[PDB]
Each structure stands twice: as structure tokens, then as C-alpha cells.
Design a protein around this ligand. Structure first.
Ligand SMILES: O=C(O)c1ccccc1O
Ligand SMILES: O=C(O)c1ccccc1O
Ligand SMILES: O=C(O)c1ccccc1O
Length: 581
């Protein structure tokens, strides 16, 4: 119990780290305020922290972190006219103020995308003003992702600064930044999606779900570790992720640094893969710890049968300590199956706990729990088969064609959801195909299924804001590990009334082909989703031929003049073909 815990966080983290963390927290909490106001509040907070470090016996720096942030934050957000539904939260009292600030986070705010000015002007601005430029970048990226992982964003800002200092000073400006900027953008999107998955799992399913997930992941990653060390590590990791997902960025980063230090200080007791890159500094060290590859398998392990199935008092020990028994079973099973996906292990553990809860408090317990392992056969067979045929389809269809197939399939599964979110989710679902299908079958399943869970959680999050689909919210809320089997087993929504025909959405303009290739891809996919929504009963071949003709026509008479005639009467042929179907 350190007096003035703000001073403790300040001395543990550092001046620059504290500035970046408080700026990220302010930007995430308040996504509408201008950058200058956030800078002013950050400066006031850091000056106050400096003063209380100088004198920890101050009158009012004994205030708690949540209370201090709320009081120093909503004094400028009090403007009802300027913002609207933002000042109401702090009118109440703690801890409800922090909770209200938490639920008010907007996952998809109405914000313009990055403009990406010219390389030379950005590098000159970096040279003229470095810290302000990094602050602006952090503020923008935090606003566009309210649930991003703060220490990871610190590392990303470090890499951004390193790239600017290192390359743009050279003669070539756009030769190096653009690939680097693309790589960091992709990594940031992946990390944001993963952290949103973690936070959503935490908030919507309590302690046990995240604890089991992290136990399974760490056991898969660290086979050589004993169960006590694994339990300590998962407890600390769950504490860290709870702290970040609840807006306590300071202590979350401090705890993550402490956890990384503890892991790198006990390498022999967990894994040997950490030795190669524990030497690099704390941010990059934690970057290693986040994504260190699986440690080598120990030899001559027990076949899981002498204690979990053949035990004469298996669920006696289960009843003695339910959580401990489930943790032991999940850890042991994840030891022998590194190729198994994390969600698969969670489902198998759920099946095992259901079996023990169901059929050993009876006359013949062993007669039930002796053959529980055959129940695992379909649970592991179906996802492997699904991924196998999906990768076989992708390898022949190609990127854009797999995207088309996925959009068609998901729009047939649930057309109630709005077009843009479905387009983006299915675009990510097409991206995972190129991301993981190239891997061998040993590593094909884990990464693919994990990214599928991430994208499905993204769909659930973008759907909960405007719930319009019963089935989607139904199996986004009823279970987390069962989301992929739900969306895999969903059928065509026959009850849905086909959307009324609207020829305006098929109007064309030269901006289709005079703009970038990507925007053309999204526009064509959006038109595809709209047409599928209009006629869900249409077959794959009909849609494919129609859109091939669409692209052929668009390129054919946009590459030349006479756009007005194309639009006007080839729209008549468009509607005629739609009638002909
Ligand atoms: O580097 C980026 O462009 C980026 C974009 C979104 C989120 C985090 C990031 O680092
Ligand atoms: O650096 C860590 O402590 C860590 C470990 C596992 C997963 C995510 C993490 O940030
Ligand atoms: O249809 C699926 O659920 C699927 C399966 C494997 C890869 C990507 C996917 O969208």
C-alpha cells in the first residue's frame, strides 16, 4: 500500500512512458475532443504527478487513480452542447463513473480514415517536431481503436519513431516508408482485433472463461512448465488483461513489465525459446513473450488415462476442487496436443466437465466416464474437415473468388445484418484464407481457427450496437467457444423476406474505375451483398456470371468515353437481366 500510487506508477514507468500511457487513456476515453485539449490535460496530469513525486505528502494526490482521471478528465467534457451524451457519466459517483465511461466506448466511431500525406512533408514535420508528431499519432490511433492494447501501442509508437529516424533521412522517401507503414498497419489491425477479442471475452464471460483460455494457450506454448508455475503465470496474465480491458492502463503496463521480467528471470522453469530474445529491452522483450513460438515437446508423457478416466475416484477429486481439476485437465490435454486449437481444447474441456457433472453421481459412474474420449472424436474431426475443404476451395478459387464465395455464403446465412459490416467481416474471413491455408496441416488448424474466432467476435461486436439479427446475437451471446460451430451450422434464412428491388444502388459512375483498386473491390462486394440480399434464392453460378458481366462492362466502357450512355441504357439492360435472373 504505497502512498500516492500515482507516484509509484510514475517512478516505475518513466516520464515518456507515463506521457504516452495517459495520452492513450485520454484518447480512448474521449474520442471526440480535439488533440490540443488532450495535450493540455496530459500536461496537467503529468505536472501534478511530478509535483506529488517531489512531495508525496501533498493534500490531494492521495486521490485514487480512477477518481483522479475522472476529475481531471470530465471537467473539459462537461460541455453538453459540444459533445452530447458524454458529460453524464461523471455526474454520478464512483465507481459508477468509471463504469459509465467504460460502456460509452464506441467500437466504430464515425471518424474519417487516414489521409496519409506525402512522405517528404511527414518526414520534415517529424524533423521539426518529433514528440508532438508521435503524440498526434498515438492520439489518432487510440481514437480509432478504443480497446487497443496500451503497451503494444507503446511498442508500435517506438517502431514508428525508429522508422522515421532511420530511413526518411535518406535520399529515397517513399521507397521504404510505404512497405513499413503497410506492415505496421497490418500488425496494428491484427493486434487490435486480438485485444478486442480478449476484452470482449473478459467482460462478457467473467473470470473463468479467460482463465481457461489463457491456461490452454500457455500450456500449449510452454509444455515444460509445471502446473504451479502455469497457474501463477495465468493468474498474473489475467490480472494484466483485466487491468487493461477496464481502462487502468498505468498499472496494467506496470504489471505487464513485471510479468515479463519474472518470465525472463525463470527461463529454465518454463521454456528455452525465450533465451534468444530476453536480452532486448522491455517493450521488445514483452513483444517476444507475447508471440514466442511453441517450446519443444517433452518425451515419454503419460497417456492421460491412468488418472483422468481410469481413476477409481476421479470425480471425487473433481468435487474436492472443481476449478483445480478442470485446470489440471486442460493443462495436461494441451500438453500433448500443440496442434489442437485453443478453442478446440476449451470445447473438449467443457464436454469433459459436462460429463463429470452429469454421470458420476449415480449407481455406475465408471460405466459412463470410462468412454468419454469417443465424445472428443466429432469435436476434433469436424473443424479439421471444415478447414481442410475450405483451404482446398481457396487454393483453387483464389483471393477475390474466395471473398465472393464467403460473402455469398454469409449473406445467405444471415441477410438481416447491414451491408458494410458484413462486407468487412467477410473480407477478413477471406484474408484468413491467404493467412493460414499456406501453412502445413500441422499448423493449419490453430492459427486459422483462432483468427476465425477473432473475426466472428468482430462481427458480434459490430452487431451488438444495432442488433437486428436474432440468430447472430443468439449464438454470439449464448457461448463464446461455440460461435464457430454456430456460424458453420447455420442454414439459409428462409424466414427472411427478400429485400425490395432498388435500381439506384446499381447506378454507376467513373469513380468506380478511376479510384484505387481496393475501393473498387469493396464497392463491387457491396453491390454483390445488396443483390444477394435482394434475391437470396439465387445460385452461385448465376451470381458469378452476373458479376463477371458487371466487371467486364464497367472496365469495357469506362476505359473509354461515352459514360453517360453506358449508365443510362445499360442500366436498363441491368434491370432486364435482374428480371431474367
Ligand atoms: O501503424 C498503423 O498504421 C496502425 C493502425 C491502426 C492501429 C495501430 C497501428 O499501429
Ligand atoms: O507479456 C506478457 O506478459 C504476455 C504474455 C502472454 C500474452 C500476452 C502478454 O502481453
Ligand atoms: O466458413 C467458415 O467458417 C470458414 C472456415 C475456414 C476458413 C474461413 C472461414 O470463413
Amino acid at each position: 500500500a504505497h502512498k500516492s500510487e500515482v507516484a509509484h506508477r510514475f517512478k516505475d514507468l518513466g516520464e515518456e512512458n507515463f506521457k504516452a500511457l495517459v495520452l492513450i487513456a485520454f484518447a480512448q476515453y474521449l474520442q471526440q475532443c480535439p488533440f490540443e485539449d488532450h495535450v493540455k490535460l496530459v500536461n496537467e496530469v503529468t505536472e501534478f504527478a511530478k509535483t506529488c513525486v517531489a512531495d508525496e505528502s501533498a493534500e490531494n494526490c492521495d486521490k485514487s487513480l480512477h477518481t483522479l482521471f475522472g476529475d481531471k478528465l470530465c471537467t473539459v467534457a462537461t460541455l453538453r452542447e459540444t459533445y452530447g451524451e458524454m458529460a453524464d457519466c461523471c455526474a454520478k459517483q464512483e465507481p459508477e463513473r468509471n463504469e459509465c465511461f467504460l460502456q460509452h466506448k464506441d467500437d466504430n466511431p464515425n471518424l474519417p480514415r487516414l489521409v496519409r500525406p506525402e512522405v517528404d512533408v511527414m518526414c520534415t514535420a517529424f524533423h521539426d517536431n518529433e514528440e508532438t508528431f508521435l503524440k498526434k499519432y498515438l492520439y489518432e490511433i487510440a481514437r480509432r481503436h478504443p480497446y487497443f492494447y496500451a503497451p503494444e501501442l507503446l511498442f508500435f509508437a517506438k517502431r514508428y519513431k525508429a522508422a522515421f529516424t532511420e530511413c526518411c533521412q535518406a535520399a529515397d522517401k517513399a521507397a521504404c516508408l510505404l512497405p513499413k507503414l503497410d506492415e505496421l498497419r497490418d500488425e496494428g489491425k491484427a493486434s487490435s482485433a486480438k485485444q478486442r477479442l480478449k476484452c470482449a471475452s473478459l467482460q462478457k464471460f467473467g473470470e473463468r472463461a479467460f482463465k481457461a483460455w489463457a491456461v490452454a494457450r500457455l500450456s500449449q506454448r510452454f509444455p515444460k512448465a509445471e502446473f504451479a508455475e502455469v497457474s501463477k503465470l495465468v493468474t498474473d496474465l489475467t490480472k494484466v488483461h483485466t487491468e487493461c480491458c477496464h481502462g487502468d492502463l498505468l498499472e496494467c503496463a506496470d504489471d505487464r513489465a513485471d510479468l515479463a521480467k519474472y518470465i525472463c528471470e525463470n527461463q529454465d522453469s518454463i521454456s528455452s525459446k525465450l533465451k534468444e530474445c530476453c536480452e532486448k529491452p522491455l517493450l521488445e522483450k514483452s513483444h517476444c513473450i507475447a508471440e514466442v513460438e511453441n517450446d519443444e515437446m517433452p518425451a515419454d508423457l503419460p497417456s492421460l488415462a491412468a488418472d483422468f478416466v481410469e481413476s477409481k475416484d476421479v470425480c471425487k477429486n473433481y468435487a474436492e476442487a472443481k476449478d483445480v481439476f478442470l485446470g489440471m485437465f486442460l493443462y495436461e490435454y494441451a500438453r500433448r496436443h500443440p496442434d489442437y486449437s485453443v478453442v478446440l481444447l476449451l470445447r473438449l474441456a467443457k464436454t469433459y466437465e459436462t460429463t463429470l457433472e452429469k454421470c458420476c453421481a449415480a449407481a455406475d459412474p465408471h460405466e459412463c466416464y470410462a468412454k468419454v474420449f469417443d465424445e472428443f472424436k466429432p469435436l476434433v474431426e469436424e473443424p479439421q474437415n471444415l478447414i481442410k475443404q475450405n483451404c482446398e476451395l481457396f487454393e483453387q478459387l483464389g483471393e477475390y473468388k474466395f471473398q465472393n464465395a464467403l460473402l455469398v455464403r454469409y449473406t445467405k446465412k444471415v441477410p438481416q445484418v447491414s451491408t458494410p459490416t458484413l462486407v468487412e467481416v467477410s473480407r477478413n474471413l477471406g484474408k484468413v484464407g491467404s493467412k493460414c491455408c499456406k501453412h502445413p496441416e500441422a499448423k493449419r488448424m490453430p492459427c486459422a481457427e483462432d483468427y476465425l474466432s477473432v473475426v466472428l467476435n468482430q462481427l458480434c461486436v459490430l452487431h451488438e450496437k444495432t442488433p437486428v439479427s436474432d440468430r447472430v446475437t443468439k449464438c454470439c451471446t449464448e457461448s463464446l467457444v461455440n460461435r464457430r460451430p454456430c456460424f458453420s451450422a447455420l442454414e439459409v434464412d428462409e424466414t427472411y423476406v427478400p429485400k425490395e428491388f432498388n435500381a439506384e444502388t446499381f447506378t454507376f459512375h467513373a469513380d468506380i474505375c478511376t479510384l484505387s483498386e481496393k475501393e473498387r473491390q469493396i464497392k463491387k462486394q457491396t453491390a454483390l451483398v445488396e443483390l444477394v440480399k435482394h434475391k437470396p434464392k439465387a445460385t452461385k453460378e448465376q451470381l458469378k456470371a452476373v458479376m463477371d458481366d458487371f466487371a467486364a462492362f464497367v472496365e469495357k466502357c469506362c476505359k473509354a468515353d461515352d459514360k453517360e450512355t453506358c449508365f443510362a441504357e445499360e442500366g436498363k439492360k441491368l434491370v432486364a437481366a435482374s428480371q431474367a435472373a
